[model samples]
Target chain A: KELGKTLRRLRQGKQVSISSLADEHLSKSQISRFERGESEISCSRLLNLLDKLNITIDEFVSTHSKTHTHFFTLLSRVRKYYAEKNVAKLLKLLEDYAHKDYESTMIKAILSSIEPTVEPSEEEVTRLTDYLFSVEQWGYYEIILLGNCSRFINYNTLFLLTKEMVTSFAYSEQNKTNKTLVTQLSINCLIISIDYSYFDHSHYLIEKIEFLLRDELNFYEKTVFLYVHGYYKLKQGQVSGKDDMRQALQIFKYLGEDALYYSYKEHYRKEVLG
Target chain B: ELGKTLRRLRQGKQVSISSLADEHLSKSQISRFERGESEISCSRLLNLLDKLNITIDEFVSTHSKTHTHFFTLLSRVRKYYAEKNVAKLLKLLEDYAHKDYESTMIKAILSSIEPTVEPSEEEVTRLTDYLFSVEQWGYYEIILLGNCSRFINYNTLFLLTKEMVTSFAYSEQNKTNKTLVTQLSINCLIISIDYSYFDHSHYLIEKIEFLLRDELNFYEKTVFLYVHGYYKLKQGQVSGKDDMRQALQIFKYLGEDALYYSYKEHYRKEVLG
Candidate 1:
């Protein structure tokens, strides 16, 4: 359906006329009809026309999809690799697609973030951050931040990054529906605050995050929330905190996160059971 | 603050307001304490809290957070009981004694926190009353019903949530109340998925998609994408993963690490677990 429109766009961009481009393989009216989406062309004929336009089928296919559409397609493909637990191909795709543009750049940042040796450059981080904020592209920013979360050995740097992210969302005048961004940002800040022992600030952020989620946390969010909350309760010497951690562990085990599950199990034994 | 805290604790325990009154405190005196209209003597205050099994520290700490936090703490308490941490869970309840707390969300949390797994008729009645008193359907309704899912029957909660979604959808104020509608719709959709109520889920999703086109900001759009994508996946649609990926990307871009990780965790369960 979109092929005809894409061909027309490509044709127009090249300043070519349908009549001139048409020949024995296709008629002028046929080309005109194709551009107008009035008729479908045979694959061979389409290939012939693509050749005449000096573009490959791959290029045409890529152009046939919208940029955002193409970005999602790439993202899904990348996610499939992650789902398959194949980090090698995930990195390969990131390597091949690196520096392609905004969307790919964000993906590369995420892929590289998982690598111990590869730190995202300050310039790339700023560019991605600035561009995402400018266009209000939250999904991309989330991928970047979550990807980079564990890479920060310095708590202060992570705290600053989270603070900036929170402030940016706060000032964005987002609609109520979009308030999840503020909630998510605050959640991130809260985690960071807790990690750094910023107890007073952590409490404020925790309350803010709770208000935003208001017990509407999704399955995964609820697990993390329970874990952090349970830990907080434990720190306050509230034995019920073990319940939060236990629930979190159950979710982790359900998700097949053996590493996290075992880690929590050990903590549970040492703290609550003991 | 103590009065209010005591009242909330009493209601949470399903203790009748009149029961707390006896030889030491009259019904009117207890009523005044609940209303924050009169101060209780230290002895009487301690006596009331003792009756509720709440400590003075817990009573004072209960006023630290808003209703939202109180509900959250209640949820944690329920989780503690579920995990078989009986003593610890009971101890946590000590900190949440408050008055004037009539939200069904908190009540539902309390019901689940109880030792019995089966929801009593009385519990159901309380939930039914809260649903009836829902003058305007909004986030509170979603939270109340969603949190109450553990205590209420599937069909019961489903019907109530559906009614809420239907009312919001048909209301002329839907445009102005977009957030509430969206939240309720998503909540209903999630419940439907859990119950395999696809037809209603699809209907709600379509409405959400249409409504979100011109009006939904970034965060809501991401939420819509996640819910829609998740529904499709449960239905075994080929594009579900792609849809989810888009939503994840949006969450990441928004710097929503919690949601980002949540999606990842959810995906892991779907694909691996």
Candidate 2:
């Protein structure tokens, strides 16, 4: 009943007539009355109608319902609270909204990442990666999981998870969103690996990050790529990369990103400049 | 959705990500939003992408650009086949030959180049079986059959082509690829007509005409007329040549100098035979 009302509005909104919208596959009356809410259109015919309507089921659902206040309401707030540095509200939302590990762990993962305040532990991260491995489609959730939880997962599992992510999402350059998400966290893992002195793993992340940074690159990913790789080289007893880290930090200064500039500026002074 | 495309365009432009801040559309939310840790509601996401200088159609289009490994290798193999450079092709096979359909594809393409290097009868059958076993056919299926059709048995290729024609449908998600699939179908029909497979060519002309339908964009309309005319002329119809010339004029009127002359030369070559 609801679908009929929605369809009639959507179809008429486009100025598409009932006959023009009806393919040879359906009766004109079928489409007309179906929209009048006098009849039911099966899934097969519904898909066809949606196609003629020049929309997708995904589009239809999001635009159709009032139930959408639930969609971004949780994560958007978690982020709002996090940006405000109100960590307790982050935990509070976890209880109020998080019904399962998918939600709770995400909230906690974001909490842990915010600068406890960051293991935790063997068992906890094990559950995190286990949940990560369980999902089939690697979308936003998977990207966020690794972004926050990479440091907690054991070194070997972290390598395996990152490798699986890189290979599985072999998604092309067209989808810049996935590319940006994956590459940003990669620098996170890169710095962490170098921190652990896991040179072999560090070596591989450097290669992958270099390949990605080799693109119609963005500022944030490009600088992090430079800063972290520079960190890696100087640590390994090398400056070419030292110059790179300095350049990356200087660019941040010029860009008026003082908070980021000062943060990396200190790291540079402590790690290599001294 | 995490607005992956939105973030990329924003980050690329060196512009901050948003019209955003509808009281709630703050910049930090987008930073979190793009990071995929948070979500942007659909309306906000559209507004975000708009600010990033793209529309939602293109945002979704980029999401599906695919670039799957099979396609990557298919294009490479196709280049070598065009060059007739089996030397480099055999090397490519060594690198990507482990997968089932991929290995079959390499051998199938190789068989086309050098009659000496052949796919076994069993290999051909295995690929045909795989094509039929699949529930839905997409780019990979259409490309694979188009490339390897010559190697396939006459009647079997005919039957599979019929099945392909009958099963295909036009839906919104697939609309962009529709013309591409139809072009490949015409290529397949051209091969049959050239080989004098009249009955099979006739079937394709009829079914393909049906698929082209009345609402054909001028390009497809011209293409269908040219292809149908080609099939008819090869079967000894004089009016078929007239239909083809008319289609050629349509291409000419559209300033398709390439298609106009390409069809002109094609007509010259075919009519003499």
Candidate 3:
């Protein structure tokens, strides 16, 4: 109902009539039905409606927070709690979350990893995966949820979903495609595959992460890709990934990227060298 | 009405209402819809459009040109401001429509130059609120904040600049854009020192001190060195004059003659005064 009400509010704010917004895409009655919560519209229709109103989703999310708590904003606070290492706080989230089929299960999986309270049951994992897989159009919410739960998703499901996500993100219908966040998720996927020693899956990801892989998203990415590339090579009994990473570290230093330079400097010595 | 657009396209295609209506729509309904007395449902409208040799993209593109229209005006505004033509800038805004985000921004450009039209306290707050509301600091935000630095609430400017730094001081997919953001940070530093806001000056100094390193490009490093020295000169270090002069000398040395004179003007006006 809040979703419909929010659309109504923005439509009124933009002063675009229901008929004009319906345009050649939606029916006028359908627009009225959606605003009154008598019916639901698909995500693409919602995007077209919002686009016609000339409002960005980020701005809509900001407005929506005024009347209600957003799930994603709530999720951000959970990350803060976990980052601060508040153990009790993470457990409390399991209860505080909306008690629903998918949301609760996803929260449970996140809590399981946060403190290892209990592994997310297969039932729990499948529920979250089904929610992700069922959605045709992926947005930041999908990427964010997948990023949080990618590990507990089991190897096969993880590989399958990651492949779809990799391509789904290629050319986006949403203007705020957030190439940066997508690149980060790909890096996380590569790291996870390498650690699990999924040779073929990791190689598929490795070749994908190159030019088609992200091409540095035009700079901070290649150094990161090189670091991960070297990490993969190291597990295969080659120290030459050292040169790949060592000089990647040098490229960072040469750019005067202080934080990344020192960060890889430590990782090179600690994880790769030892 | 989209009705008129349909009529024009239909006429141009040499299709009669009677012939097109045979596809699905009735003749009188198509005739009335073309005359704006009735509405067509989305699917039938698509069917009508398809029969008339119109693509979906063509209809949408032909219908909307306002987004590009606004940017064109803003570019005109930019060209005026760059040529040091505040008189014409203020004139361009005359009789301009009020009540848009860009509407208020042009007024801000006004107060920044035409000192007689000072930005009211409320307008300053609106600019700050707008910066906070936008998700990321695009060049538009950077330009607004930089131009309004002298007038913004010192505390608020410090917070906004620090927030911008924390988020985008380092990122990919930009070169000049990131530098523009970095310069806005130093701009706050420069303004705080000029106004002698001791509290924010000390606060910004600590932040900029950490942000400065070999990582900065030539322009940013030089701006920081000059502003850093300006802060020093205000802090009662006389040799800080040398620091400012050295930065000025580099601009001249590197044949940045236009920039060289601007810094020279800053020295003579603010410091030598």
Q: How would you encode candidate 3's per-residue C-alpha lDDT over B63-159 as one tens digit per residue?
A: 4443333344566787788787887887766645453445566777776556687666786787788677654454455666776677777788888
Deviation in Å, model 3, residue A253 alpha carbon:
9.9
For residues A1-274, what per-residue lDDT tens digits would candidate 1 score against the true structure?
Answer: 5367778876775555787568897787877776787776644466567655544343454445423233445666766676676668876776777755444555555565455554556666566454433422233234344334324324554445454444443211111223444555456556556556688777866766666565343334545667676767777768887667776675554334577678668756865677
lDDT of 2 at A37: 65
Q: Where does model 1 sit among the CAPRI classes? A: incorrect
Instruction: Tell me the lDDT of candidate 2.
Output: 0.63
Instruction: Give the true-contact fraction for every prediction, in order.
Output: 0.00, 0.00, 0.00
Which stretches of candidate 1 lie above 4 Å from their native place?
A1-71, A85-88, A100-109, A112-150, A163-189, A215-219, A251-274, B1-273
Chain A TM-score values, per prediction? 0.54, 0.74, 0.63
lDDT of 2 at B9: 48
lDDT (Cα, tens digit) per residue for candidate 1, span B1-273: 456756766765567877767676677878877787876554455456555544333344344433233344555755675686656654554553342123334444544545443445675666656565554344334445556666666667657766666543122111334555566567667778877888878777886776565442335556666777788887879677777776675455334688899888887787668
lDDT of each: 0.56, 0.63, 0.64
Worst 10 residues of 1 chain A by lDDT: A169-178
- Candidate 2 docking quality: incorrect, acceptable, medium or high: incorrect
The order by descending TM-score is 3, 2, 1
Backbone clashes in model 3, listed as residue pairs: A209-A213
lDDT tens digits, residues A1-274, model 3? 3457777876774445787668677788888887787776644466577665555433443444521234444566676677787768776776776565555666766776656765667887787788667644344556767877776787778777777777664232222233555666677778668777877877988876664533222334555667778888977889877667776675555444678789778867877666
RMSD of every candidate to native, in Å, equals: 26.8, 20.6, 13.3
